[PDB]
CSV table of C-alpha atoms and ligand atoms in Angstrom, one decimal:
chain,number,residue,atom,x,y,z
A,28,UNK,CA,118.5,80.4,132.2
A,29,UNK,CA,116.7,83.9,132.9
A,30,UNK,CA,116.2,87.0,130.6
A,31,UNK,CA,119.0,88.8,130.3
A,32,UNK,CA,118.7,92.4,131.9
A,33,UNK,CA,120.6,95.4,130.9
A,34,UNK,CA,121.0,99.1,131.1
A,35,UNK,CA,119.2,101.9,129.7
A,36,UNK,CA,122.4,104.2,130.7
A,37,UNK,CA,125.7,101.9,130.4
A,38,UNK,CA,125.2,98.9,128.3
A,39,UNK,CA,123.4,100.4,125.8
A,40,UNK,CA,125.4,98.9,122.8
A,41,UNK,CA,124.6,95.3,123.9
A,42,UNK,CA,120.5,95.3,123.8
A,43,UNK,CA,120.2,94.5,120.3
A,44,UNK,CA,123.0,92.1,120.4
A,45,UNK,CA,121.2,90.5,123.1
A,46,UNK,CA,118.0,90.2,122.1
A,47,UNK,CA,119.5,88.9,118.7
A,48,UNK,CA,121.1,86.1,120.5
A,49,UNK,CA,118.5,85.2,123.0
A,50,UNK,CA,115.5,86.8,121.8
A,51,UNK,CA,114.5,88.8,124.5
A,52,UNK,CA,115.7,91.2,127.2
A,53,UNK,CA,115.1,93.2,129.5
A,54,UNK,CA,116.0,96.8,129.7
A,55,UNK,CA,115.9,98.3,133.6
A,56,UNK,CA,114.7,101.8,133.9
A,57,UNK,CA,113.7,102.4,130.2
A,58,UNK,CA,111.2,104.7,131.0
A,59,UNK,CA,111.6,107.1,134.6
A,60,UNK,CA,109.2,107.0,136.8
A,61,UNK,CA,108.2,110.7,136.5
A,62,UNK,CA,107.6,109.6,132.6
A,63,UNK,CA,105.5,106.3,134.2
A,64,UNK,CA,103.5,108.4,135.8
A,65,UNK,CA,102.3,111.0,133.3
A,66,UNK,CA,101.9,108.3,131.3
A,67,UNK,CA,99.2,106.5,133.8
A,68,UNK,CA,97.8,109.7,134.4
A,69,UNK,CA,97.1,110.5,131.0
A,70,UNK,CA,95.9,107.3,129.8
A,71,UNK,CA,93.9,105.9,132.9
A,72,UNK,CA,90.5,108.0,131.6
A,73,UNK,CA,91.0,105.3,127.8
A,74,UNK,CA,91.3,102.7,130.1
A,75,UNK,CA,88.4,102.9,131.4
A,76,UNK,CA,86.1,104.0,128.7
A,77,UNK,CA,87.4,101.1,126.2
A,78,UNK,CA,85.3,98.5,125.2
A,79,UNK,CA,85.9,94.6,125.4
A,80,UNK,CA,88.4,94.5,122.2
A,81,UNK,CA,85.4,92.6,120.4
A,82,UNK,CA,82.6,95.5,121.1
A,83,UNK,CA,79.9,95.3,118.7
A,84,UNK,CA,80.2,99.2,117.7
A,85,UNK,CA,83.8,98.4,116.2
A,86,UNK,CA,83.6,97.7,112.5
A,87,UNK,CA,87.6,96.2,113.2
A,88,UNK,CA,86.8,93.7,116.4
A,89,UNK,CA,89.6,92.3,117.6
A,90,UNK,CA,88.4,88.8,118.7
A,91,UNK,CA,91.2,87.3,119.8
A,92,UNK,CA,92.5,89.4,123.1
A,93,UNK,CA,90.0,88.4,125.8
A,94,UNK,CA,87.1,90.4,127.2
A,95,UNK,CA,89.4,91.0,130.9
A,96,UNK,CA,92.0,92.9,128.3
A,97,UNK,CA,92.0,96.6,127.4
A,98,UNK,CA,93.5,97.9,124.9
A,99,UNK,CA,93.8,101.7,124.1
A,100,UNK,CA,95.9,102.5,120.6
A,101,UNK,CA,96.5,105.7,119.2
A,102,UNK,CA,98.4,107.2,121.8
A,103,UNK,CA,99.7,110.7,120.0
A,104,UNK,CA,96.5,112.7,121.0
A,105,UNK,CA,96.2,111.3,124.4
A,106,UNK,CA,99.2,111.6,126.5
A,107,UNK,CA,102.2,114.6,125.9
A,108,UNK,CA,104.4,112.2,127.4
A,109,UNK,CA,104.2,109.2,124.2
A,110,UNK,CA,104.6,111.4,121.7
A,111,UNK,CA,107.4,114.2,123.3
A,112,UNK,CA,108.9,112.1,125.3
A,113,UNK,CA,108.5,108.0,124.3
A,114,UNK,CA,108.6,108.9,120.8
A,115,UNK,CA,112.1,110.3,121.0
A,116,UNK,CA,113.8,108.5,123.0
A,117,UNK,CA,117.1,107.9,122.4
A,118,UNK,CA,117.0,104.6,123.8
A,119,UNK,CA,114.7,103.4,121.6
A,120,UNK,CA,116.5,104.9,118.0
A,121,UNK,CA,119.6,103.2,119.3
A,122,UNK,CA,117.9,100.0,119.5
A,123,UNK,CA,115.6,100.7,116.3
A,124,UNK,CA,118.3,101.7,113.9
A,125,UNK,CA,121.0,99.2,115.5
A,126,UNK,CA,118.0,96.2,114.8
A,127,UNK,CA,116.9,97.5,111.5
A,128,UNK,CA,120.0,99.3,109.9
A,129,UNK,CA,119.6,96.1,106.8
A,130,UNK,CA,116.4,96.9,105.7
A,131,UNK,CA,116.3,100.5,106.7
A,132,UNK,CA,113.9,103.4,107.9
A,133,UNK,CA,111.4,102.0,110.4
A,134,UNK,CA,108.1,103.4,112.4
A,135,UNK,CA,105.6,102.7,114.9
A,136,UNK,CA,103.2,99.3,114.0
A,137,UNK,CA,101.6,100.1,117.4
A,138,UNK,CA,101.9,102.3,120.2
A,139,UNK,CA,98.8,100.6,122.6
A,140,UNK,CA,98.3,100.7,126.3
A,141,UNK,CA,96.9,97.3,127.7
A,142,UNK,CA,95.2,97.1,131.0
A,143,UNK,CA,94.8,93.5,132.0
A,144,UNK,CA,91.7,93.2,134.6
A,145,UNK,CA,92.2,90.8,137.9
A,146,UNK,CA,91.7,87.0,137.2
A,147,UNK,CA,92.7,87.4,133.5
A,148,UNK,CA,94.2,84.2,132.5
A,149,UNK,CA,97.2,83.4,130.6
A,150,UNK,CA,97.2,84.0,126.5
A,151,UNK,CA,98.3,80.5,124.5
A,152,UNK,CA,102.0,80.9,123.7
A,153,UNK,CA,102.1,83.3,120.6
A,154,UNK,CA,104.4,84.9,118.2
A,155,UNK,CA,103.5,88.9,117.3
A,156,UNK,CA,102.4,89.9,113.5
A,157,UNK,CA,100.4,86.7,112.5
A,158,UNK,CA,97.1,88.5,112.8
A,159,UNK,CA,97.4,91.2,110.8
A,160,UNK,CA,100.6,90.7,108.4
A,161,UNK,CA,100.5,87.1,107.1
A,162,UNK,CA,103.6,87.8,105.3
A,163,UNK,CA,105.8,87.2,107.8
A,164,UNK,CA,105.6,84.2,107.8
A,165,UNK,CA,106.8,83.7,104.2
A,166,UNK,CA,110.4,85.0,105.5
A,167,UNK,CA,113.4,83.1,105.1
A,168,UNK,CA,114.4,81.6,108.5
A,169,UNK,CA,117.8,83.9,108.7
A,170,UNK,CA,115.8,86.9,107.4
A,171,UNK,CA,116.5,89.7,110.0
A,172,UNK,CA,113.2,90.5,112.7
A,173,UNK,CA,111.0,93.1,110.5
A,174,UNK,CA,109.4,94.1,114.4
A,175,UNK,CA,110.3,94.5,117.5
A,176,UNK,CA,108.4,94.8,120.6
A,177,UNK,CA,108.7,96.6,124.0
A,178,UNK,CA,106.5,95.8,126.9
A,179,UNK,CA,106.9,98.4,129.0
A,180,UNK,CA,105.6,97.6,132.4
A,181,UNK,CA,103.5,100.7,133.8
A,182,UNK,CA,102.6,98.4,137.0
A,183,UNK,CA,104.6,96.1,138.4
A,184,UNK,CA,105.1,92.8,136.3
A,185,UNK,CA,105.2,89.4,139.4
A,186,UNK,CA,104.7,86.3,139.1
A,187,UNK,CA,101.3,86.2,140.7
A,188,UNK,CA,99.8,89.1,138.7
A,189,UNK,CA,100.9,88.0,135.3
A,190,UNK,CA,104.5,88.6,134.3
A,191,UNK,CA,105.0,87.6,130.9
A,192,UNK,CA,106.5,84.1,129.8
A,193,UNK,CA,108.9,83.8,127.1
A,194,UNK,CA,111.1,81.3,125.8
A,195,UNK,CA,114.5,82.1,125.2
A,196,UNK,CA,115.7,81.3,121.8
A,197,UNK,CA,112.9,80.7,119.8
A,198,UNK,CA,112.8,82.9,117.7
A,199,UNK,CA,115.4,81.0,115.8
A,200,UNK,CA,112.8,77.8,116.3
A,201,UNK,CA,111.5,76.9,112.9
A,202,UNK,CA,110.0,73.6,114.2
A,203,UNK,CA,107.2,74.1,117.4
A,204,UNK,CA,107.3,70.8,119.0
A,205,UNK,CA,108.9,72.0,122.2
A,206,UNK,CA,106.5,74.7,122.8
A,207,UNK,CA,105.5,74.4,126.3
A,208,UNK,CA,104.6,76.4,129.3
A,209,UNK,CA,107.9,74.4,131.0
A,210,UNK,CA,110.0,75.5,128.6
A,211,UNK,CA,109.5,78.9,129.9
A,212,UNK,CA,111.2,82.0,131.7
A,213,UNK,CA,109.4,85.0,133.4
A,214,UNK,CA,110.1,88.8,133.0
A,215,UNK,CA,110.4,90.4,136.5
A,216,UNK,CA,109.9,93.7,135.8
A,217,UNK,CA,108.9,96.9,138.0
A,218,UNK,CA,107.6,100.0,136.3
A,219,UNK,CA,109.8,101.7,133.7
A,220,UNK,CA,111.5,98.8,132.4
A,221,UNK,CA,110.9,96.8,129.4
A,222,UNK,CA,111.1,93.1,128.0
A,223,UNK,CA,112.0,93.5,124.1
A,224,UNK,CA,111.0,90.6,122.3
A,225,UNK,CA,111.6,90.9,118.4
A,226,UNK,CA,108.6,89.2,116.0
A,227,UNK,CA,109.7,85.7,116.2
A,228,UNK,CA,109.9,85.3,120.2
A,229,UNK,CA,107.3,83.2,121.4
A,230,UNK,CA,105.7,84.1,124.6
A,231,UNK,CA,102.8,85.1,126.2
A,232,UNK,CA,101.3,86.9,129.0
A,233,UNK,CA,100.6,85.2,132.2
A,234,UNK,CA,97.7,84.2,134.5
A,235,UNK,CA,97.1,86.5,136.8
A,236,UNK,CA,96.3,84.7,140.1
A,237,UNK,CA,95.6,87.4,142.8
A,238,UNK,CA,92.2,88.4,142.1
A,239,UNK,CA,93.2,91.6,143.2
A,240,UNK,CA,95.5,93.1,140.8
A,241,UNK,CA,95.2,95.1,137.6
A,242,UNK,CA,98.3,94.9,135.7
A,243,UNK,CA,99.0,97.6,132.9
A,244,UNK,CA,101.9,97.8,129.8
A,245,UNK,CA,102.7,100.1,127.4
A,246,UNK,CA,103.5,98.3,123.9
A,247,UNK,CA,105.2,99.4,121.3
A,248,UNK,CA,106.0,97.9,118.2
A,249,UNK,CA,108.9,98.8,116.0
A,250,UNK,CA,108.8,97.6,112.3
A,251,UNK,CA,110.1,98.4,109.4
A,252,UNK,CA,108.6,101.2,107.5
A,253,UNK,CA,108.3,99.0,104.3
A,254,UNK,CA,105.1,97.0,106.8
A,255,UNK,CA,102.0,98.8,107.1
A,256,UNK,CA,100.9,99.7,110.8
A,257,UNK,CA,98.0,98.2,112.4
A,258,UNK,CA,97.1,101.6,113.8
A,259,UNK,CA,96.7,105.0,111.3
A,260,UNK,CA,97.2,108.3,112.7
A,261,UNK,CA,95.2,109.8,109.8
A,262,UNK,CA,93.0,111.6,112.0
A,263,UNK,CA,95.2,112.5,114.1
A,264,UNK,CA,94.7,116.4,114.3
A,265,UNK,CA,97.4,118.4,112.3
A,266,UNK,CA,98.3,121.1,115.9
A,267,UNK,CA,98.9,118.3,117.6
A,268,UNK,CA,100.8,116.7,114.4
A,269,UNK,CA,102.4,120.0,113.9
A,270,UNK,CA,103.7,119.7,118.0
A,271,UNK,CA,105.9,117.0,116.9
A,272,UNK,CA,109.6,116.7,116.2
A,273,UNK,CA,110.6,115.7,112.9
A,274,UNK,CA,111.2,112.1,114.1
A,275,UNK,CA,107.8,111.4,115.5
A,276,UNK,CA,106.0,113.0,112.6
A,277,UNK,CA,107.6,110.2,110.5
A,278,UNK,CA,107.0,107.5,113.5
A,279,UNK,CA,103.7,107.9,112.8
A,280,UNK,CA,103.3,107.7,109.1
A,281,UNK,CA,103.4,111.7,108.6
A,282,UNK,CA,106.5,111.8,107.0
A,283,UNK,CA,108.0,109.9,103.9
A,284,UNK,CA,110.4,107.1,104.3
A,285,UNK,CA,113.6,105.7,103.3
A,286,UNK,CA,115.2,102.2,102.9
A,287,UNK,CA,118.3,101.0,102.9
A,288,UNK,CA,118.6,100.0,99.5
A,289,UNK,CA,121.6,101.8,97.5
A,290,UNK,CA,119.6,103.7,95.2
A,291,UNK,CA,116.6,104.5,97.1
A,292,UNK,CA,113.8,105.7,96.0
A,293,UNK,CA,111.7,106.3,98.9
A,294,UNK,CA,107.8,105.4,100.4
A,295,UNK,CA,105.1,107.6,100.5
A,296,UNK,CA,106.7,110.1,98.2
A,297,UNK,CA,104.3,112.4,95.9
A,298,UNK,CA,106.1,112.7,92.7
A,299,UNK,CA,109.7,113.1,93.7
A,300,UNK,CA,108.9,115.2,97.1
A,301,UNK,CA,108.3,114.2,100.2
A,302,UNK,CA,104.9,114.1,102.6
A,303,UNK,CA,106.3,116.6,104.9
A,304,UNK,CA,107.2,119.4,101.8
A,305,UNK,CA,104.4,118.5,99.8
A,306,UNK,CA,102.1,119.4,102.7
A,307,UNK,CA,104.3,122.4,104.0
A,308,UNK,CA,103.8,120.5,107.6
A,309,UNK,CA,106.4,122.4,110.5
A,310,UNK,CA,107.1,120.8,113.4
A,311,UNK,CA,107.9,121.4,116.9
A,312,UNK,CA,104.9,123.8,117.4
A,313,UNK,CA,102.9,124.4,120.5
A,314,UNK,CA,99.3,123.4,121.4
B,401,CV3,C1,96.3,89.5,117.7
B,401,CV3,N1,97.3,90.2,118.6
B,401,CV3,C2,97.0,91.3,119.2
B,401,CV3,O1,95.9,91.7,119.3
B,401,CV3,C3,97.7,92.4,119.7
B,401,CV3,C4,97.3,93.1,121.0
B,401,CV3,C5,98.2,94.3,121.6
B,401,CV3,C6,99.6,94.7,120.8
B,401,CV3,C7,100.0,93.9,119.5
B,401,CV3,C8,99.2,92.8,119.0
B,401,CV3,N2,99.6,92.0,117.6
B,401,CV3,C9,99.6,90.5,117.6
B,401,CV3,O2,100.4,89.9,117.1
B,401,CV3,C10,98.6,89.9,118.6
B,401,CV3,C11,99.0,88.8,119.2
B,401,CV3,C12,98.1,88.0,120.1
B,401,CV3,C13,97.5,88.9,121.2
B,401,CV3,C14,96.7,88.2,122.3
B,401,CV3,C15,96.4,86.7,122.2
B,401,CV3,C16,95.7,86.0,123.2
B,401,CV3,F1,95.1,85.4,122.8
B,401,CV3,F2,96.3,85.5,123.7
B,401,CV3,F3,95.2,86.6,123.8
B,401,CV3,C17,97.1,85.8,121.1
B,401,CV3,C18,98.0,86.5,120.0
B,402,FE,FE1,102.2,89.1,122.0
Protein backbone atom coordinates (compact mmCIF):
# COMPACT_ATOMS: atom_id res chain seq x y z
CA UNK A 1 0.00 0.00 0.00
CA UNK A 2 2.06 3.11 -1.41
CA UNK A 3 1.95 6.88 -0.43
CA UNK A 4 -0.67 8.45 -1.66
CA UNK A 5 0.24 11.30 -4.29
CA UNK A 6 -1.75 14.21 -5.14
CA UNK A 7 -1.89 17.57 -6.87
CA UNK A 8 -0.43 20.85 -6.06
CA UNK A 9 -3.02 22.33 -8.86
CA UNK A 10 -6.37 20.07 -8.78
CA UNK A 11 -6.74 18.09 -5.67
CA UNK A 12 -5.76 20.50 -3.46
CA UNK A 13 -8.67 20.05 -0.91
CA UNK A 14 -7.73 16.41 -0.31
CA UNK A 15 -3.95 16.79 1.12
CA UNK A 16 -4.82 17.34 4.49
CA UNK A 17 -7.50 14.84 4.49
CA UNK A 18 -5.07 12.49 3.26
CA UNK A 19 -2.31 12.86 5.31
CA UNK A 20 -4.93 12.82 8.26
CA UNK A 21 -5.98 9.40 7.23
CA UNK A 22 -2.71 7.81 6.18
CA UNK A 23 -0.21 10.02 7.58
CA UNK A 24 1.64 10.93 4.78
CA UNK A 25 1.50 12.08 1.12
CA UNK A 26 2.93 13.15 -1.39
CA UNK A 27 2.28 16.31 -3.15
CA UNK A 28 3.75 16.31 -7.06
CA UNK A 29 5.14 19.55 -8.26
CA UNK A 30 4.88 21.54 -4.97
CA UNK A 31 7.66 23.61 -5.72
CA UNK A 32 8.58 24.40 -9.88
CA UNK A 33 11.51 23.68 -11.00
CA UNK A 34 12.51 27.33 -11.85
CA UNK A 35 11.82 27.82 -7.88
CA UNK A 36 14.13 24.35 -7.33
CA UNK A 37 16.69 25.79 -8.85
CA UNK A 38 17.11 29.21 -7.31
CA UNK A 39 16.76 27.52 -4.42
CA UNK A 40 19.99 25.08 -5.08
CA UNK A 41 21.66 28.00 -6.35
CA UNK A 42 21.24 30.05 -3.48
CA UNK A 43 21.80 27.62 -0.80
CA UNK A 44 24.72 25.35 -2.40
CA UNK A 45 27.62 27.96 -0.95
CA UNK A 46 25.74 26.88 3.14
CA UNK A 47 26.13 23.54 2.11
CA UNK A 48 29.26 23.51 1.75
CA UNK A 49 30.63 25.67 4.50
CA UNK A 50 28.46 23.84 7.32
CA UNK A 51 30.01 21.91 9.79
CA UNK A 52 29.33 18.20 10.89
CA UNK A 53 25.90 19.14 12.93
CA UNK A 54 28.10 18.22 16.16
CA UNK A 55 31.02 20.90 15.39
CA UNK A 56 32.82 21.79 18.38
CA UNK A 57 32.39 25.80 17.68
CA UNK A 58 28.45 25.29 18.18
CA UNK A 59 27.50 25.99 21.71
CA UNK A 60 23.87 24.02 20.47
CA UNK A 61 25.48 20.59 18.83
CA UNK A 62 23.18 18.71 17.43
CA UNK A 63 24.50 15.14 18.08
CA UNK A 64 22.09 13.13 16.78
CA UNK A 65 22.07 13.75 12.70
CA UNK A 66 25.27 11.98 11.57
CA UNK A 67 28.53 13.55 10.49
CA UNK A 68 27.57 12.56 6.33
CA UNK A 69 24.37 15.08 7.10
CA UNK A 70 24.23 18.90 6.47
CA UNK A 71 22.14 20.90 7.68
CA UNK A 72 21.74 24.70 6.92
CA UNK A 73 18.67 26.52 9.04
CA UNK A 74 17.80 29.91 8.80
CA UNK A 75 16.91 30.27 5.39
CA UNK A 76 15.31 34.07 5.24
CA UNK A 77 18.74 35.83 4.70
CA UNK A 78 20.08 33.24 2.27
CA UNK A 79 17.89 32.51 -0.54
CA UNK A 80 14.96 35.32 -2.10
CA UNK A 81 13.27 32.33 -3.25
CA UNK A 82 12.30 30.81 0.75
CA UNK A 83 11.24 33.71 1.96
CA UNK A 84 9.26 35.46 -1.31
CA UNK A 85 8.34 32.64 -2.82
CA UNK A 86 8.26 29.30 -0.30
CA UNK A 87 7.03 31.38 2.42
CA UNK A 88 3.88 32.36 0.62
CA UNK A 89 2.79 29.80 -1.01
CA UNK A 90 -0.54 29.24 -1.32
CA UNK A 91 -0.18 25.63 -1.27
CA UNK A 92 1.25 25.51 1.82
CA UNK A 93 -1.52 28.06 3.86
CA UNK A 94 -4.13 25.78 2.38
CA UNK A 95 -2.65 22.89 3.95
CA UNK A 96 -1.44 24.94 7.22
CA UNK A 97 -4.67 26.48 8.07
CA UNK A 98 -6.85 23.39 6.73
CA UNK A 99 -4.43 21.12 9.41
CA UNK A 100 -4.32 23.63 12.14
CA UNK A 101 -7.70 25.59 11.92
CA UNK A 102 -8.49 23.76 15.92
CA UNK A 103 -5.72 25.18 17.58
CA UNK A 104 -5.16 28.21 15.40
CA UNK A 105 -2.36 30.60 14.09
CA UNK A 106 0.75 28.59 13.21
CA UNK A 107 4.58 29.42 11.98
CA UNK A 108 7.71 28.02 10.85
CA UNK A 109 9.54 25.46 13.63
CA UNK A 110 12.17 24.99 10.88
CA UNK A 111 12.88 25.97 7.52
CA UNK A 112 16.47 23.79 7.08
CA UNK A 113 18.10 22.61 3.93
CA UNK A 114 19.80 18.98 4.39
CA UNK A 115 22.38 17.80 2.10
CA UNK A 116 22.94 14.05 2.73
CA UNK A 117 26.71 13.04 1.55
CA UNK A 118 27.14 9.61 -0.57
CA UNK A 119 27.25 6.44 1.61
CA UNK A 120 25.15 8.00 4.39
CA UNK A 121 23.19 5.36 5.91
CA UNK A 122 19.75 5.04 6.99
CA UNK A 123 18.44 7.09 10.36
CA UNK A 124 16.62 4.47 13.03
CA UNK A 125 12.85 4.91 12.44
CA UNK A 126 11.84 8.31 14.20
CA UNK A 127 9.00 10.46 14.96
CA UNK A 128 9.80 14.59 14.56
CA UNK A 129 9.59 16.92 17.81
CA UNK A 130 11.03 14.52 20.50
CA UNK A 131 14.38 16.28 20.63
CA UNK A 132 13.61 19.56 21.26
CA UNK A 133 9.75 19.72 22.56
CA UNK A 134 9.26 16.87 25.09
CA UNK A 135 5.80 17.89 25.41
CA UNK A 136 4.47 16.25 22.73
CA UNK A 137 4.54 13.48 23.89
CA UNK A 138 2.20 14.29 26.89
CA UNK A 139 -0.71 14.67 24.10
CA UNK A 140 -3.81 12.86 24.18
CA UNK A 141 -3.72 10.19 21.49
CA UNK A 142 -6.72 11.94 19.40
CA UNK A 143 -5.17 15.33 20.02
CA UNK A 144 -4.83 16.99 16.50
CA UNK A 145 -0.83 16.93 14.93
CA UNK A 146 0.68 20.30 16.51
CA UNK A 147 3.50 19.99 13.22
CA UNK A 148 3.71 19.15 10.09
CA UNK A 149 6.45 18.47 7.91
CA UNK A 150 7.34 18.83 4.17
CA UNK A 151 10.39 17.16 2.70
CA UNK A 152 10.76 18.84 -0.28
CA UNK A 153 13.09 16.86 -2.53
CA UNK A 154 15.66 19.45 -4.31
CA UNK A 155 17.38 16.18 -5.96
CA UNK A 156 15.82 13.40 -6.91
CA UNK A 157 14.54 11.03 -4.05
CA UNK A 158 15.28 6.72 -5.45
CA UNK A 159 15.50 3.99 -3.90
CA UNK A 160 19.28 3.62 -4.17
CA UNK A 161 20.12 7.11 -3.05
CA UNK A 162 17.94 7.25 -0.03
CA UNK A 163 14.28 7.95 -0.49
CA UNK A 164 12.68 8.25 2.72
CA UNK A 165 10.72 5.27 4.52
CA UNK A 166 7.53 5.85 6.19
CA UNK A 167 4.93 3.79 7.57
CA UNK A 168 1.54 4.46 6.71
CA UNK A 169 -0.72 4.88 9.60
CA UNK A 170 1.30 5.24 12.41
CA UNK A 171 0.79 8.08 13.52
CA UNK A 172 -2.32 6.79 15.01
CA UNK A 173 0.10 3.89 16.62
CA UNK A 174 0.19 4.39 20.28
CA UNK A 175 1.86 0.97 20.87
CA UNK A 176 5.56 0.44 18.76
CA UNK A 177 5.80 -3.17 18.63
CA UNK A 178 5.37 -3.32 14.87
CA UNK A 179 8.00 -0.89 14.11
CA UNK A 180 10.10 -2.33 11.44
CA UNK A 181 11.95 -1.58 8.34
CA UNK A 182 9.33 -4.22 6.57
CA UNK A 183 6.57 -2.52 7.59
CA UNK A 184 7.71 0.22 5.36
CA UNK A 185 6.81 2.29 2.10
CA UNK A 186 9.15 4.56 0.05
CA UNK A 187 8.54 8.20 -1.20
CA UNK A 188 9.45 8.37 -4.95
CA UNK A 189 9.88 11.71 -5.48
CA UNK A 190 11.67 13.94 -8.21
CA UNK A 191 12.52 17.53 -7.44
CA UNK A 192 9.73 19.84 -6.53
CA UNK A 193 7.54 17.52 -4.88
CA UNK A 194 7.07 16.84 -1.30
CA UNK A 195 6.18 13.90 1.23
CA UNK A 196 4.14 15.60 4.16
CA UNK A 197 4.37 13.65 7.14
CA UNK A 198 2.57 15.34 10.31
CA UNK A 199 4.55 14.91 13.95
CA UNK A 200 3.41 11.49 14.72
CA UNK A 201 4.51 9.61 11.33
CA UNK A 202 7.22 7.42 11.86
CA UNK A 203 9.80 7.20 9.24
CA UNK A 204 13.15 7.78 8.43
CA UNK A 205 15.49 8.50 5.72
CA UNK A 206 17.11 5.91 3.82
CA UNK A 207 20.54 4.32 3.04
CA UNK A 208 21.92 5.63 0.45
CA UNK A 209 23.71 2.83 -1.49
CA UNK A 210 25.43 4.39 -4.68
CA UNK A 211 28.42 5.82 -3.32
CA UNK A 212 27.94 8.32 -5.78
CA UNK A 213 25.14 10.43 -5.05
CA UNK A 214 24.49 13.48 -2.87
CA UNK A 215 20.85 13.74 -2.09
CA UNK A 216 19.49 17.23 -0.95
CA UNK A 217 15.77 18.32 0.85
CA UNK A 218 14.36 21.23 1.78
CA UNK A 219 12.35 20.80 5.23
CA UNK A 220 9.94 22.69 6.58
CA UNK A 221 8.13 22.32 9.61
CA UNK A 222 4.72 23.76 10.33
CA UNK A 223 3.55 24.04 14.03
CA UNK A 224 1.47 25.78 15.83
CA UNK A 225 2.35 29.11 16.86
CA UNK A 226 1.54 28.31 20.64
CA UNK A 227 5.23 25.80 20.13
CA UNK A 228 8.40 27.60 20.20
CA UNK A 229 10.62 27.15 16.98
CA UNK A 230 13.82 25.37 17.14
CA UNK A 231 15.26 28.09 14.89
CA UNK A 232 15.01 32.16 15.87
CA UNK A 233 15.22 34.68 13.33
CA UNK A 234 16.23 37.32 15.96
CA UNK A 235 19.04 38.35 14.04
CA UNK A 236 17.76 38.25 11.13
CA UNK A 237 18.41 41.84 9.65
CA UNK A 238 15.30 44.22 9.81
CA UNK A 239 15.76 45.27 5.42
CA UNK A 240 15.63 42.08 4.74
CA UNK A 241 12.69 41.62 7.53
CA UNK A 242 11.20 44.64 6.24
CA UNK A 243 11.26 42.78 2.42
CA UNK A 244 8.67 40.54 3.69
CA UNK A 245 5.01 40.26 3.19
CA UNK A 246 2.96 40.47 6.12
CA UNK A 247 2.52 36.63 6.24
CA UNK A 248 6.24 35.73 6.35
CA UNK A 249 7.05 38.39 8.85
CA UNK A 250 4.71 36.47 11.22
CA UNK A 251 6.16 32.91 9.79
CA UNK A 252 9.08 33.82 11.28
CA UNK A 253 8.24 34.99 14.72
CA UNK A 254 8.16 38.84 13.63
CA UNK A 255 4.72 39.37 14.08
CA UNK A 256 2.22 38.64 17.00
CA UNK A 257 -0.04 35.65 16.93
CA UNK A 258 -3.44 34.46 17.28
CA UNK A 259 -5.28 31.26 18.40
CA UNK A 260 -8.28 29.86 17.97
CA UNK A 261 -9.75 30.24 21.17
CA UNK A 262 -13.13 32.37 21.24
CA UNK A 263 -11.86 35.19 23.24
CA UNK A 264 -8.36 35.37 22.23
CA UNK A 265 -6.00 37.14 23.58
CA UNK A 266 -3.11 36.79 21.55
CA UNK A 267 1.04 35.71 21.72
CA UNK A 268 3.78 37.88 21.72
CA UNK A 269 1.62 40.96 22.34
CA UNK A 270 3.29 44.14 24.19
CA UNK A 271 0.53 45.44 26.33
CA UNK A 272 -2.58 45.16 24.17
CA UNK A 273 -0.60 45.90 20.71
CA UNK A 274 0.90 43.87 18.52
CA UNK A 275 4.90 43.20 17.55
CA UNK A 276 4.45 44.56 14.13
CA UNK A 277 2.79 48.23 15.52
CA UNK A 278 4.70 48.34 18.46
CA UNK A 279 7.88 48.32 16.41
CA UNK A 280 6.39 50.46 13.39
CA UNK A 281 7.89 47.39 11.11
CA UNK A 282 6.41 47.84 7.12
CA UNK A 283 6.64 45.24 4.94
CA UNK A 284 7.01 44.50 1.40
CA UNK A 285 10.10 46.77 1.02
CA UNK A 286 13.11 46.35 -1.27
CA UNK A 287 16.67 45.38 -0.56
C1 LIG B 1 16.74 15.53 16.18
N1 LIG B 1 16.08 15.78 14.82
C2 LIG B 1 16.66 16.61 14.06
O1 LIG B 1 17.78 16.95 14.15
C3 LIG B 1 16.16 17.34 12.93
C4 LIG B 1 16.98 17.57 11.67
C5 LIG B 1 16.37 18.35 10.45
C6 LIG B 1 14.85 18.90 10.54
C7 LIG B 1 13.99 18.65 11.84
C8 LIG B 1 14.60 17.90 12.98
N2 LIG B 1 13.70 17.65 14.37
C9 LIG B 1 13.64 16.24 14.87
O2 LIG B 1 12.69 15.83 15.33
C10 LIG B 1 14.87 15.36 14.63
C11 LIG B 1 14.64 14.07 14.35
C12 LIG B 1 15.72 13.12 14.08
C13 LIG B 1 16.69 13.54 12.98
C14 LIG B 1 17.80 12.59 12.61
C15 LIG B 1 17.91 11.21 13.31
C16 LIG B 1 18.94 10.32 12.95
F1 LIG B 1 19.35 9.98 13.72
F2 LIG B 1 18.48 9.64 12.50
F3 LIG B 1 19.63 10.65 12.38
C17 LIG B 1 16.88 10.78 14.40
C18 LIG B 1 15.77 11.75 14.78
FE1 LIG C 1 12.47 13.15 10.76
Amino acid sequence: SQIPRLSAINDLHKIWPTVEEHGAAIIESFLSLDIVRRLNEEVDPFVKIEPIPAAKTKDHPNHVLSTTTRLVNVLAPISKAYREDVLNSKVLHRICSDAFHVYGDYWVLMGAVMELAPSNPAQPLHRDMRFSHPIVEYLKPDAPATSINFLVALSPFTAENGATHVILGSHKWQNLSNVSMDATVRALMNPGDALLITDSTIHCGGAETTGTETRRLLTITMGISQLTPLESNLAVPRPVIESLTPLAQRLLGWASQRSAAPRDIGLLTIRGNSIEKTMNLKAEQPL
